[PDB]
Recover the amino acids of this structure.
């Protein structure tokens, strides 16, 4: 058994790493702290952390939005400190309930939401630059920055793009623990059971696959951890016995395999496609499809089942039946 | 037929049962005893699905469905057309999954590596049992289990979730979803990082393990490490079905109301009410 | 009139549905599946373009690996049909076959952020420590699978880049020793280091290295491979049926 | 935090749809023993005599009964509405023709309403029907009523906490949540849907593609409507003590035929019935009830689902007195 794959039995300490970046070496902040219990399942050193203009813009815009949201939450309980801590999950900031179209809604009905939405967007955009710039500041590929973009893009879809495309701010996602959860069903109901949106199935297929892949890959690297498999950069440019057996375990199992490099393209793609498929689903939704179930019925894809309890005629269509 | 570095490894041994008898390869596939039993269960299972699909007004994949019995049959045997086909296929599916798992144990054994992959594979097998056996057994009938059809089994999940009003409030479900999300996130980060170091652009120098840790020290103020991301990863991915199983088995056997109401334990406490 | 409606019974979302499948299979088959075949190919007994990595401190390496000279097998086939298993003609631990096999990758000690040797002893490692709370293997006995003292701790070897110990190395009783053991193969107790991968008589062959202060990559693989070969070959009792 | 096994499960859809009820025996058992307090019908009486339109001076609804039959009704009503204070709750001690107290004039209206339900709304109550008890359960104030805003507790026989009181605005979200099965849906389905016939419960389109003229900008209903519909559904479900699959195949909530249960259609006739009761019988009563009965906007107590069901698919589990008191309806 590998006791190293469970926890690191013997832990190592030494002088701080510091690799210079093209800029901002001085804007690193924090004296690095060592946690013994953290270092049983990760590296013990916590910090330092890089500030830099994009990073601080993120916290500025971000906090601004959160403040808006928390303040609007506090008012929902008359600013009672007890009830706020109590009802917190039920509290939220809601998009306009009346139909103002794309017109900027009143502060008490959607206004504060739109503004909190705006500052949140600025916050995400600020952090993106951080993710991007830090990559090429350290002479690294922007693979992370572009994955993070797909997630940012999708949030924009459910946040403002799809609202703009259908022409209503009322279709936005509220801020809150339960309230933003409530939106999920209101949106699915409105558009005819989202189980019948193909890009929904696609997005799910990719998300599940993200589970499968890093369950398999995560376990794969643990299995060849005795051969220093976790050292992957120097297993790509230079193949050793770790991914020899890793490539062969899967080749003997499913009939084909990847490389130590290419398996990372598989996981990056799957993750990307969770967002890519989702965004396409939301865009199509409302715009060009108004009921995904009926859309499937039209194309003869929807399943049909025999009656258990008798067929029930729509009473609204009965002769003499009320409005 | 073989990889450039492969024949080095194709030695005998590492069998659990069978010895030399099934210790051989078919193309790139290893067989072993559990290769033989897998094919048996898979042939039988697919045949049953085929013969069952023979019978309905079937044939286009999206409309093909093989359903469990009525609730009234309890845990008893059902008429093959009225649920029995499902019962058998269920069994075959379990034979196939477990075989596939132990086959992986045999392959790990011959390669001299840890058994982490087939041990990981026990988690989805486990969840399948929760859905198709466990929760039915507690509820008393097999008819509570999901049907085998590409679209039909979605409608099973759909109705089941609504049977508890808003399935979103299911705390077991909240944990499960949380793990599915963060796992997809971590996979994107990790794969993206490794590529960033090996594929950094233009006429480049491939960067180092110090650049790895470097990057996440700057962005979030911590890097978990090269080896630790892989145990973290197996941890997040596994806890999808490890935590989610609680919310599934709790629905029915241990809770019959809507899941939003379940949070009455927090909301209805006398000194907040 | 309807949004998204086209000619016949056709609509926009219907078209995108096909485009989605086309893109996905294009990426999977005409990219990801080809990216998978960068090493191990071509087969013996569809491929992609070359690629050239520029390595951190001098030199390049490019997909495939067109290699020095190739090792000579020390195994005999068990039967003549294509998929038959093979069988060790000597001691499978010494000719590095099966789970005892290693990779033929450059005998270079590969390095740190700044040039130094990455995997080095604490007698070298300057400034590296054992974290307060974890046990010090310094001077402990190494107990093999047969229960016999195979020897005693000498030093522990650290990755200078990741701050992570990867090898114990130790003395054998009775051969003027010393050689490597990956700590994936060790169970660190308070008074002993338990190793069940090999018997104590078999520590005698643990691949030595031209250096006492170094360790190169082929080495790292040569050392790790042999202990892993013990999981199947240490006794006649491991090539078994478990049942 | 949890309810011990086993659990009572029913099947309402095709096998393998996971459609049906999920009930906890202890809850169900408790509800029967509560609904079993339905007083037994009074023994039958003399069929002959002059109609009380001859006999009594101020009888305008039940004027065709004989005196023995008419008094029987008065005993039953007394049982059902005001058993503790008896007749004098609704009668001047020695002038029984007098409408000098308010429960008299309301009780007349209440007689007509009850007959209305059993006669005109047989698409809902069928031959089960209702009596005074179905809502009152032995008290002048029905336990489950609803004002023009969320109130707590749902049962007015229970003492409200401070935060539950309608005046305490810090607790508005909870009042809203508990009427909607503890969801955070920010909508009151009673006033939106059940108090009147103004708004439409249906919000899901009946075409695949968006219909031009109703799918862009201010042509569209706000998404808020689907929320509120969800809120009505949460409320109805808790009121009957079931879930969605009791009525829907959640494959497509918007569809009837095999995609719905006969109960959903019955339920449809209930909403229509409840609106009728509120708009034409109960709401106009604020002019006859004392100020102490009225809500904060001068509203009289009005009925929803729960008013009769009180947590059950059928009120009092199908118990009826319909043939025991034909004067209560249906009416020829
Ligand atoms: C409680 C949760 C639900 C559930 C909820 C959902 C939802 C919701 C969705 C799916 C989707 C899918 N589900 Mg399901 N699913 C459950 C359990 C299962 C089981 C099982 C053994 O228990 C199977 C085989 C499947 C199979 C599948 C696929 C048809 C599809 C894509 C999944 C995917 O990419 O995964 C990750 C795996 C990979 C990326 C690798 C490739 C796997 C391929 C796709 C497997 C195809 C198997 C196919 C059914 C044939 C079976 C065998 C025949 C004998 C040939 N589900 C349970 C019952 N599943 C989506 C869909 O599109 O459905 C139509 C979807 O929207
Ligand atoms: C009744 C309710 C509906 C439902 C409603 C919806 C709706 C509506 C949608 C989905 C969507 C998704 N659903 Mg669905 N869903 C249901 C049933 C399921 C089932 C199932 C087995 O039953 C599964 C597996 C899923 C799973 C999925 C996902 C695969 C998919 C993408 C969303 C996602 O991952 O977001 C997780 C990822 C993110 C949110 C990205 C976040 C990225 C950003 C950068 C994070 C920012 C953090 C930062 C700190 C925030 C600071 C804030 C401060 C204020 C500043 N759903 C049913 C049918 N679901 C989407 C989709 O694909 O639609 C086509 C979608 O829009
Ligand atoms: C209205 C309906 C409800 C809903 C109803 C349910 C129900 C009901 C359940 C879930 C469950 C799950 N839900 Mg859901 N869920 C909803 C909304 C969501 C949302 C969202 C964005 O709102 C998300 C992210 C999710 C996500 C999730 C998953 C994380 C979770 C576990 C899935 C599972 O069991 O897979 C199961 C997958 C397997 C068992 C795969 C097994 C594979 C086996 C081992 C091998 C197969 C081999 C194959 C056949 C081989 C083919 C050969 C080919 C060659 C490849 N749900 C809505 C609100 N959801 C479950 C849970 O845990 O709940 C707490 C659950 O029980
Ligand atoms: C399929 C692919 C997916 C994926 C991918 C990726 N995700 C990434 C990256 C990639 C590739 C990054 O590179 C980036 C990162 O850094 O990685 C280390 C990142 C991130 N993913 C976050 C959260 C997240 N991802 C989710 C979803 C998925 N992601 C899906 C699954 C979800 C869900 C499911 O809800 C969540 C919550 C943040 C941690 C971070 C952005 C922070 C931000 O933009 O902050 C901007 C906001 C702030 C700076 C606010 C700071 C607030 C403090 C408390 C201020 C004080 C306030 C005061 C108390 C007020 C009163
Ligand atoms: C939490 C951890 C998770 C995780 C992890 C891992 N996953 C693994 C491993 C690990 C670690 C492996 O090592 C192993 C493997 O080698 O990978 C390449 C495996 C694999 N994961 C597969 C599918 C998969 N994983 C899912 C879920 C998770 N995986 C989650 C995320 C899902 C979902 C979500 O639906 C799917 C579809 C196969 C591709 C493969 C097994 C092949 C098999 O077992 O062959 C043996 C069986 C057959 C070839 C067919 C048997 C057919 C029966 C008899 C007849 C049909 C019956 C069937 C019930 C009908 C269903 C109808 C349908 C519409 C309802
Ligand atoms: C050479 C070699 C061995 C290659 C092997 C490569 C290999 C096996 C790769 C596997 C990895 C792959 C390809 C993964 C892709 C699968 C993924 C991620 C997702 C699939 C999920 C999936 C089936 C989604 C379907 C979406 C849904 C639910 C659709 C229902 C609605 C529907 C079909 C409507 C009808 C559509 C239309 C317009 C017309 C049909 O008539
Ligand atoms: C002909 C016959 C009957 C022979 C009998 C012998 C026998 C047992 C045959 C088996 C027959 C059967 C059932 C074959 C089916 C095999 C299956 C299930 C194939 C499905 C393939 C699928 C869809 C896999 C999903 C996961 C996925 C997208 C993988 C793509 C990327 C890959 C290959 C990941 C695997 C992989 C991972 C995860 C690494 O970490 C790693 C690290 C270092 C080097 C290589 C690798 C590597 O290859
Ligand atoms: C909850 C209301 C209520 C209760 C309880 C009640 N009454 Fe009645 N009573 C009425 C109403 C209203 C009328 C007139 C109904 C009508 O016009 O058809 C009426 C009519 C009568 C009349 C007709 C007198 C006349 O000249 O019009 C008599 C007598 C009478 N009730 C006696 C009784 C008796 C006896 C009891 C109990 C044992 C009783 N009441 C309890 C409300 C009530
Ligand atoms: C006992 C009855 C009943 C229950 C319980 C019930 N439904 Fe409803 N539902 C109906 C009826 C009747 C309508 C249509 C009302 C109308 O036509 O005015 C409807 C309408 C709907 C609609 C909108 C249909 C459309 O055309 O827009 C949705 C969505 C819905 N229900 C979902 C649910 C949800 C969600 C639940 C529970 C959480 C639920 N059903 C439980 C009877 C019920
Ligand atoms: C004033 C009386 C009253 C009100 C208000 C009321 N119900 Fe009913 N309902 C009844 C009675 C009495 C029955 C018994 C019918 C039967 O036994 O078939 C019934 C039957 C039903 C059934 C049939 C259950 C079954 O198992 O067959 C459903 C569903 C239902 N009601 C839903 C509702 C809905 C929806 C509402 C309001 C929106 C409502 N109830 C409010 C009196 C009422
Ligand atoms: C104290 C610490 C460590 C953290 C604090 C976090 C905290 C307690 C926050 C408080 C309450 C909580 C938990 C809030 C959570 C809210 C959630 C879950 C929100 C989820 C999704 C919200 C979404 C997707 C909103 C999207 C909205 C948008 C993208 C709007 C876009 C707006 C624009 C583009 C503006 C352009 C239009 C212009 C003309 C005005
Ligand atoms: C992806 C999310 C990862 C979250 C990990 C954050 C851990 C907190 C680390 C904070 C580092 C701040 C510097 C520490 C020294 C304090 C001065
Ligand atoms: Fe990796």
């Amino acid at each position: 058994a590998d006791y190293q794959t469970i926890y690191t039995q013997i832990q190592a300490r030494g002088p701080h790493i510091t690799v210079s970046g093209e800029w901002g070496d001085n804007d690193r902040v924090g004296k690095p702290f060592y946690s013994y219990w953290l270092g049983k399942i990760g590296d013990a050193q916590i910090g330092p952390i890089y500030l830099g203009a994009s990073g601080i813009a993120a916290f500025a815009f971000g906090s601004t939005a959160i403040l808006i949201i928390l303040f609007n939450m506090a008012a929902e309980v008359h600013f009672d400190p007890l009830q706020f801590f109590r009802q917190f999950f039920w509290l939220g900031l809601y998009p306009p309930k009346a139909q103002y179209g794309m017109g900027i809604p009143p502060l008490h009905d959607g206004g504060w939401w739109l503004m909190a939405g705006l500052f949140m967007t600025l916050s995400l955009g600020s952090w993106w630059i951080r993710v991007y710039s830090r990559a090429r500041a350290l002479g690294l590929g922007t693979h992370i920055a572009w994955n993070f973009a797909a997630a940012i893009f999708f949030v924009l879809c459910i946040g403002c793009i799809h609202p703009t495309l259908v022409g209503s701010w009322s279709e936005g996602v509220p801020f809150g623990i339960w309230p933003h959860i409530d939106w999920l069903t209101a949106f699915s109901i409105r558009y005819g059971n989202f189980y019948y949106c193909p890009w929904h199935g696609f997005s799910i297929g990719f998300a599940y696959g993200c589970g499968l892949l890093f369950a398999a890959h995560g376990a794969t690297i643990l299995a060849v951890a005795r051969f220093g498999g976790d050292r992957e950069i120097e297993q790509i440019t230079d193949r050793g016995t770790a991914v020899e057996r890793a490539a062969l375990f899967w080749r003997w199992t499913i009939g084909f395999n990847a490389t130590i490099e290419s398996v990372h393209r598989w996981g990056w793609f799957f993750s990307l496609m969770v967002m890519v498929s989702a965004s396409v689903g939301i865009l199509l939704t409302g715009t060009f499809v108004d009921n995904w179930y009926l859309w499937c019925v039209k194309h003869g894809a929807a399943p049909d089942y025999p009656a258990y309890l008798p067929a029930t005629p729509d009473p609204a269509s009965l002769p003499g039946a009320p409005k | 037929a073989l990889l450039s570095f492969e024949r080095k490894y194709r030695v005998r041994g590492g069998t659990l049962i069978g010895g030399d008898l099934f210790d051989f390869w078919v193309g790139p596939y290893f067989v072993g005893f559990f290769g033989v039993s897998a094919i048996f269960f898979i042939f039988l299972g697919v045949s049953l699905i085929g013969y069952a699909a023979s019978q309905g007004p079937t044939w286009d994949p999206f409309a093909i469905s093989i359903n469990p019995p009525d609730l009234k049959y309890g845990l008893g045997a059902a008429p093959l057309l009225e649920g029995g086909f499902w019962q058998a296929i269920t069994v075959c599916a379990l034979g196939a999954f477990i075989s596939w798992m132990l086959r992986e144990v045999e392959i790990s054994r011959k390669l001299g590596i840890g058994w982490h992959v087939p041990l990981a594979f026990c988690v989805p097998i486990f969840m399948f049992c929760v859905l198709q056996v466990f929760r039915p057994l507690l509820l008393g009938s097999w008819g509570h289990a999901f049907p085998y059809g590409i679209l039909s089994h979605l409608d099973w999940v759909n109705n089941f979730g609504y049977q508890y009003l808003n399935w979103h409030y299911n705390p077991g479900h909240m944990s499960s979803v949380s793990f599915l999300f963060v796992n997809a996130m971590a996979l994107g980060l990790h794969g993206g990082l490794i590529l960033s170091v090996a594929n950094p652009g233009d006429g480049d120098k491939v960067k180092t393990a110090e650049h790895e840790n470097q990057y996440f020290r700057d962005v979030v103020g911590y890097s978990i490490g090269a080896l630790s991301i892989h145990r973290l990863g197996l941890f997040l991915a596994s806890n999808i079905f490890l935590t989610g199983a609680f919310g599934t088995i709790a629905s029915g056997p241990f809770w019959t109301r809507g899941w939003p109401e379940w949070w009455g334990w927090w909301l209805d406490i006398p000194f907040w009410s | 009139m309807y949004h998204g409606a086209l000619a016949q019974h056709l609509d926009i979302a219907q078209l995108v549905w096909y485009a989605q499948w086309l893109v996905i299979w294009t990426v999977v088959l005409l990219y990801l599946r080809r990216e998978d075949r960068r090493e191990g190919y071509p087969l013996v007994e569809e491929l992609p373009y070359p690629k050239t990595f520029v390595l951190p401190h001098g030199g390049t390496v490019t997909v495939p690996r067109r290699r020095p000279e190739t090792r000579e097998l020390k195994l005999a086939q068990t039967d003549g049909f294509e998929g038959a298993p093979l069988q060790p003609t000597g001691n499978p631990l010494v000719d590095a076959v099966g789970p005892a096999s290693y990779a033929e990758r450059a005998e270079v000690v590969d390095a740190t952020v700044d040039g130094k040797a990455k995997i080095v002893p604490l007698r070298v490692a300057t400034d590296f420590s054992i974290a307060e709370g974890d046990v010090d293997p310094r001077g402990l006995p190494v107990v093999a699978a047969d229960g016999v003292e195979a020897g005693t701790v000498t030093d522990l070897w650290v990755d200078r880049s990741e701050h992570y110990f990867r090898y114990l190395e130790l003395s054998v009783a009775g051969s003027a020793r010393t050689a490597l053991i990956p700590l994936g193969f060790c169970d660190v107790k308070k008074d002993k280091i338990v190793v069940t991968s090999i018997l104590s008589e078999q520590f005698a062959n643990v691949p030595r290295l031209q250096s006492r202060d170094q360790i190169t990559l082929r080495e790292e693989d040569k050392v790790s491979a042999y202990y892993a070969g013990g999981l199947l070959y240490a006794t006649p009792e491991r090539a078994e049926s478990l049942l | 935090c949890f309810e011990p096994p086993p659990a009572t499960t029913t099947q309402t859809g095709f096998r393998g749809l996971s459609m049906g009820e999920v009930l906890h025996p202890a809850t169900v058992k408790a509800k029967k023993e509560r609904d079993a307090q339905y007083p037994p019908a009074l023994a039958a009486v003399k069929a002959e005599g002059p109609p009380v339109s001859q006999v009594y001076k101020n009888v305008k609804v039940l004027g065709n009964l004989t005196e023995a039959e008419f008094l029987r009704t008065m005993t039953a009503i007394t049982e059902w509405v005001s058993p503790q204070e008896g007749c004098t709750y609704c009668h001047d001690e020695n002038n029984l023709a007098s409408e000098a107290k308010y429960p008299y004039v309301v009780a007349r209206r209440m007689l007509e309403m009850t007959r209305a339900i059993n006669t005109n709304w047989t698409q809902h109550v069928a031959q089960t029907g209702v009596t005074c008890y179905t809502c009152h359960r032995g008290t002048p104030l029905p336990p489950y009523v609803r004002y023009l805003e969320p109130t707590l507790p749902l049962n007015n026989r229970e003492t409200p906490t401070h935060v539950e009181r309608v005046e305490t605005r810090s607790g508005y979200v909870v009042r809203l949540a508990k009427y909607t099965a503890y969801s955070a849906l920010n909508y009151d389905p009673f006033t939106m849907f059940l108090a009147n016939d103004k708004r439409q419960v249906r919000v899901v389109p009946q075409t695949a593609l968006p219909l031009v003229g109703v799918s862009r900008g201010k042509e569209r209903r706000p998404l808020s409507d689907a929320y509120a519909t969800f809120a009505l559904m949460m409320s109805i479900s808790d009121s009957l003590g079931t879930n969605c699959t009791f009525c829907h195949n959640a494959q497509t909530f918007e569809s009837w035929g095999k995609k719905s249960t006969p109960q959903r259609a019955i339920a449809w006739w209930g909403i229509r019935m409840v609106r009728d009761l509120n708009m034409n019988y109960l709401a106009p009563l604020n002019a006859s009830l004392p100020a102490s009965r009225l809500g904060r906007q001068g509203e009289a107590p009005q009925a929803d689902c729960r008013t009769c069901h009180q947590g059950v698919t059928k009120p009092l589990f199908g118990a009826s007195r319909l043939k025991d008191y034909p004067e209560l309806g249906p009416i020829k």
